[PDB]
Amino acid sequence: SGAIYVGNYRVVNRHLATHNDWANLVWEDSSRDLLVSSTTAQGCDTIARCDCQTGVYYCSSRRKHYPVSFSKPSLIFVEASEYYPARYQSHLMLAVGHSEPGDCGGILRCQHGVVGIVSTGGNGLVGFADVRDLLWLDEE
Ligand SMILES: CNC(=O)c1cn(C)c2ccccc12
Numbered sequence: 001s002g003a004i005y006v007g008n009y010r011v012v013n014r015h016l017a018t019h020n021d022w023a024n025l026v027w028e029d030s031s032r033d034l035l036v037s038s039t040t041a042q043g044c045d046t047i048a049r050c051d052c053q054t055g056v057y058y059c060s061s062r063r064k065h066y067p068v069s070f071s072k073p074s075l076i077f078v079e080a081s082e083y084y085p086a087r088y089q090s091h092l093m094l095a096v097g098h099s100e101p102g103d104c105g106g107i108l109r110c111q112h113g114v115v116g117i118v119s120t121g122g123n124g125l126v127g128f129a130d131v132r133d134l135l136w137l138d139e140e
Pocket residue numbers: 015081082083084099100101103104118119120121122123126127
């Protein structure tokens with residue numbers, strides 16, 4: 001689990017979105033595993049605007065933050081899971097690291113702020129859904 005709270009937006013894994021999230025929908029993309037919903041109280045997170053490939057992510061299943069190198073947000077094939085069929089996920093970044101399904105929502109952060117959230121993984125690899133192209137998250 002986990003979310004990004006950027007102003008009056010809540011950014012979660014589409015596959016973990018609640019009824020309240022869907023009842024307050026701002027934007028969703030199955031191809032990106034992202035859903036954004038509206039909030040009433042403002043959040044304590046800032047979004048990175050950058051092309052950093054190094055950062056730190058939170059891994060719930062180790063209670064540990066790990067420094068990682070990660071790929072550029074790309075269109076990449078992801079093996080079938082409980083939540084999606086074998087498909088290409090868009091705006092995705094891969095790192096070498098530990099990840100389990102419930103680690104989804106863990107933040108990846110760089111010097112510029114929040115890069116993305118844990119989404120995909122397997123075989124000692126962790127995948128993060130990028131949010132840095134979502135400029136509209138920063139306004140209105
Ligand atoms: C759609 N979410 C998932 O199913 C997964 C997310 N992470 C990080 C995994 C790691 C190993 C295996 C499956 C997943």
